[model samples]
Target: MLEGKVKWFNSEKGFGFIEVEGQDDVFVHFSAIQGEGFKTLEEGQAVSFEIVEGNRGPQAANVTKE
Candidate 1:
C-alpha cells in the first residue's frame, strides 16, 4: 500500500485525485474506495491505496481513510 492524501474529490462526479508522496497524483474513483455507506473523500484527508497501471496512467485502488 502507498501513503497519500486526497488532493481533491468531486462528489457529483464520483472521482478524485490522490497526491502521492514524492510522486504524481493518482486517479481515484468512488468505486475504488472501501466501505458501504456515503462514499466520499475530502481534500487533504489521509489515505492509503494501491497503485495499479490504469488504461491511461496510474490509478488508486483499495483506498481507505487513514
Candidate 2:
C-alpha cells in the first residue's frame, strides 16, 4: 500500500488522480474506493491504497481514507 493525497476527482465522472510524495500519480476510480455512502474524494484529502496496473497505467485499488 502507498500513502498519498488526492490531487483531484470528478464526482460526476467518477475518476481522478492521486499523488504520492516522490512518486508518480495514480488513476482513481469510484469503484476502487472503499466504504459506503458516496464514493467520492475531495482535493487534498489523504488516502491509502495499493497500486494496480490498469488498462491505461498505474491505478489505485482498495482505497481508504486516512
For model 2, what is the error of residue 65's alpha carbon versus the real structure, in angstroms, after optimal superposition?
0.8
lDDT for every model? 0.91, 0.92
What are the runs in model 1 whose C-alpha is more than 4 Å off? none
Across residues 8-58, which tens digit of lDDT does each residue of candidate 2 receive?
Answer: 999998989998989889989999999989899999999999998847787
lDDT of 1 by residue, 20-56 (tens): 8799899999988997898889999999999888478
Error of 2 at 31 (Å): 0.6
Residue 15, model 2: Cα distance from true site in angstroms: 0.8
Model 1, residue 5: distance off in Å is 0.3
Q: Please list the residue runs of candidate 2 whose C-alpha ends up more than 4 Å from where it truly belongs after superposition.
A: none
lDDT (0-100) at residue 19 of candidate 1? 95
TM-score per model over all chains: 0.89, 0.91
Per-residue error at 42 for model 2, in Å? 0.3
Q: How does model 1 score by TM-score?
A: 0.89
Candidate 2, residue 39: how far the Cα is off, in Å? 0.6
